[PDB]
Design a binder for this molecule. Structure first.
Ligand SMILES: [Cl-]
Length: 200
């Protein structure tokens, strides 16, 4: 009853920055699924988009649910689409944010919808400055950015600053993080709190 409003949500997976990719490769997609399970994906509510790979190239696509097609298939489709990211490893966050901006520019949005980028990351961008530059173009267009950080390879101050908070001080509703062992229990609440803040 929380993630129930008109929102265009762009889910961006950004990892792994780690030397031992096992955790990201085994758990990033189940983590993203858990987040997506918090969303009301009725056409009058949340429209869910995801950055994915197709024909060796990065692309933004809409994810549907539960479409008029069979239940298990709709789940499998989403899970496979998300999994196209895994073979490609670490990719430019700057380029991903730029693609979201182009996507928003190419289409008319719903009159009363909010635009939101949710980033799942276990590392830091190739370029901090290029990334910050893009995020500000987005926020200048009224787009909100939330970030979920995982593990010990993240920079918390960067994540907080990226979503518009103070680098260290004060609560930041658009940011949360966790160690791998705990992410499954923290991500649901994070998505909910993100929806709440977005409606304010
Ligand atoms: Cl980058």
């Amino acid at each position: 009853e929380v993630c129930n409003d008109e929102v265009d949500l762009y889910l961006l997976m950004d990892g792994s920055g780690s030397i031992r990719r096992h955790n990201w490769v085994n758990h990033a997609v189940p983590l993203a699924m858990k987040l997506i399970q918090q969303l009301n994906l009725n056409d009058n509510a949340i429209h869910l988009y995801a950055s994915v790979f197709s024909n060796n190239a990065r692309e933004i696509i809409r994810l549907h649910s539960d479409a008029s097609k069979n239940k298990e298939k709709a789940l499998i489709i989403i899970k496979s689409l998300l999994s196209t990211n895994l073979p490609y490893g670490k990719t430019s966050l700057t380029d991903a944010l730029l693609q979201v901006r182009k996507h928003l520019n190419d289409r008319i949005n719903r009159e009363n919808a909010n635009q939101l980028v949710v980033i799942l990351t276990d590392g830091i961008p190739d370029s901090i400055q290029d990334s910050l530059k893009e995020s500000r173009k987005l926020s200048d267009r009224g787009v909100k950015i939330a970030v979920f950080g995982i593990g010990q390879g993240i920079n918390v101050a960067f994540n907080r600053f990226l979503v518009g908070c103070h680098p260290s001080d004060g609560k930041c509703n658009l940011y949360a993080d966790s160690a791998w062992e705990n992410v499954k229990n923290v991500i649901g609440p994070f998505m909910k709190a993100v929806c709440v803040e977005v409606e304010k």
